[PDB]
Structure 1
Amino acid sequence: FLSLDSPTYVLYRDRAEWADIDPVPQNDGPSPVVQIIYSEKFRDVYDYFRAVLQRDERSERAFKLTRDAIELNAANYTVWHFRRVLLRSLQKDLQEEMNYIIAIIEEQPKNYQVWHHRRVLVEWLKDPSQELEFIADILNQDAKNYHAWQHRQWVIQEFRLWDNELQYVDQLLKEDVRNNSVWNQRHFVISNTTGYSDRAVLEREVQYTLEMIKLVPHNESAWNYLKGILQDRGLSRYPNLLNQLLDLQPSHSSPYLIAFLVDIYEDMLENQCDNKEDILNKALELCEILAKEKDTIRKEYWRYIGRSLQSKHSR
């Protein structure tokens, strides 16, 4: 009703319809630490919020006030809880309240509290009809917003809305093939629908990942997805893999290609394969290329893989 940024905004201490209530000052003690020199607007709102919270006033005026208290600090979870108490006692229209949270999430998409609030609303209403399209607009503005993906996973799972997600996943991977959030979503859909054993699907997945790797060899997310899906079953269960990678080398090397080779060789040696020597030697050699030359930030890690493979595999 009166916005916090209205030129006509008036402190609660100067509003007649709040004259019956004495504000409650923050109890910080004789000697405060980490004392915030609040703005006048802020301190006014919260002085009045404490008053209504203490009296547990379940009124329409308290409700409007929680709104201003949220706007000043949307991370204050005590205000939200009280607001949810008032949404119920006053029987507020939850659809107007959905409209409200949509506006505030648009503005502060990186805050847990607003997303939790929305979840409570969808749970009360049992109505996910707006969620996929709302979430998609937030993700249109920040394609990696952690809370947005979490809210999306939650809505897909709880209401079984799986049928179109994979197409969405594809649209975004098209937009940004390096978006690890989307690679994760990919795996969330597949792994909760078809699964990764359907060999037609596992095959389509691996052809897709290799093909993306071809267009952008230095993109770490494809490489991680590729490993992610096949390592389940053990990489040496796929003998064409070793050589198909060795073919991409001349025209597509990357440290990630070399490291994936080290992972294939490890699984081969683990599965007591033909040549429990020449293979380890390719491995150690490659670790060295990594520690020494091609991936030196991870020098300590490669030294340790090198050492782990010697300790395991030469008796």
Structure 2
Amino acid sequence: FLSLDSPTYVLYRDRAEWADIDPVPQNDGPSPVVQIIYSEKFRDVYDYFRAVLQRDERSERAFKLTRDAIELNAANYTVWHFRRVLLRSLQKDLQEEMNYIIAIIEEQPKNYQVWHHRRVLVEWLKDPSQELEFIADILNQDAKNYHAWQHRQWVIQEFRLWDNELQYVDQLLKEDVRNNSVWNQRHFVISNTTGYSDRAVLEREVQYTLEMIKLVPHNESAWNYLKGILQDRGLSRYPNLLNQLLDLQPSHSSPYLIAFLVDIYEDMLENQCDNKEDILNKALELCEILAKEKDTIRKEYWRYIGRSLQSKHSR
């Protein structure tokens, strides 16, 4: 109704409909600390929310009062809770409220409180129909919005809407193959559908990831995904991989590439491979090439690795 910026906005202390209620001022003690010098409007609204909350007043007026309160500080979880308490108590039109939250989220796409409320409204309605589309719009604003990603996942699990997300992941990856949030989504879908143990699935992915690395040789996301989907499986178990990786070495190297080989060699040593010394040296070599040259930032890391390979594969 009356926006907090309206030229004609009126204080709750001067609203007749609220006359009967004695606002409750917040108490911070005799000598406040970390005390905010609230604006007059802010203090006013909250002086009345405190009064509404105190007597647990389940009225329509209070429901509307929460709107302003939220505008004034959408982070107020307490306000967010009581509003829902009211929506229930006043049998509120949930779709109307859905329209409310839609508008609000687009406004503060980074607020946790806002998405939580959407979530509740969604399980209440048991209707996820608007979700995927809406999240897609928010993700157009910020394709890495953690909150927007968590919600999509919940929606997809709760409502088992796995059918077209993998295509969505492809869409988003073409838009930005460096979007880690999307690579995670890809893993999420697959581990939640075919599973990665389906060898036909593991092959399609490893191949996909390899083409991706080929295009953007320095994109860490791709590399991380590859390592992820094969690490527990034992990198050294895939001889063809090692051969294709070494093939990138010329026109497609990077510290990630070298890093991956290190792991491969590391796995070989664990698996008690042949030419133990030859490999150990191939590994220690790279560790130093990284430590001192290609990945100096992680020099501390690389020295420990090398130190480890030695500690259990020498003499």
TM > 0.5: yes
User: Cα distance, 1:220 vs. partner?
Assistant: 0.2
Query: In structure 2, how many angstroms separate the alpha carbons of the residues matched to 1:29 and 1:138?
Result: 42
- Compute the displacement of 1:22 (Å): 1.3
The C-alpha deviation readout for 1:140-190, integer Å capped at 9, x for no partner, is 110000011000000000110000000000000000000000000000000
Partner of residue 45, structure 1: 45
Per-residue Cα deviation, 1:64-94 (whole angstroms, up to 9, x for no partner): 0001001110110111111011001111111
1:231 Cα deviation after fit: 1.0
Tell me how far apart the structure 2 counterparts of residues 54 and 135 of structure 1 sit (CA, whole Å).
Answer: 36
Answer with 17-26 or 162-171: which moved more: 17-26
CA shift, 1:31, in A, is: 1.0
Counterpart for residue 117 of structure 2: 117
- Per-residue deviation, 1:232: 2.1
1:168, 1:8 → 2: CA distance?
46
**Distance apart, 1:8 and its partner CA:** 1.4
Q: Name the structure 2 match of 1:69.
A: 69
> Aligned-pair distance for 1:293?
0.9
TM-score normalised by length of structure 2 = 0.99
The C-alpha deviation readout for 1:245-276, integer Å capped at 9, x for no partner, is 11101101100000000000000110011111
The farther-off stretch of 151-160 and 7-16 is: 7-16
Distance in 2 between residues matched to 1:108 and 1:69, nearest whole Å = 15
CA distance in 2, matches of 1:233, 1:93: 51
- State how many pairs are aligned: 315
| Alpha-carbon distance, 1:199 to partner | 1.5
**Cα separation, 2, equivalents of 1:241 and 1:198:** 18
Q: Which moved more, 1:174-183 or 1:198-207?
A: 198-207
| Range with greater deviation from structure 2 (20-29 or 175-184) | 20-29
Q: How far apart, in 1, do the equivalents of 2:6 and 2:214 lie?
A: 55
Rounded Cα–Cα distance in structure 2 between residues aligned with 1:66 and 1:302: 55
Point out where structure 2 has 5 or more consecutive residues left out of the alignment: none
Q: Secondary structure at the match of 1:277?
A: helix
Distance between the aligned counterparts of 1:288 and 1:151, measured in 2?
Answer: 43
The CA distance in 2 between the partners of 1:30 and 1:273, in whole Å, is 73
RMSD: 0.7
Show the counterpart of 2:262.
Answer: 262
Aligned partners of 2:4, 2:104: CA distance in 1, in Å? 14
Distance 2:51 2:25 in 1: 9
Q: Name the CA distance, whole Å, in 2 between partners of 1:265 and 1:8.
A: 73
Question: TM-score, length-normalised on structure 1?
Answer: 0.99
Match of 2:271? 271
- Between the aligned partners of 2:132 and 2:247, the Cα distance in structure 1 is 41
Shift of 1:19: 1.2
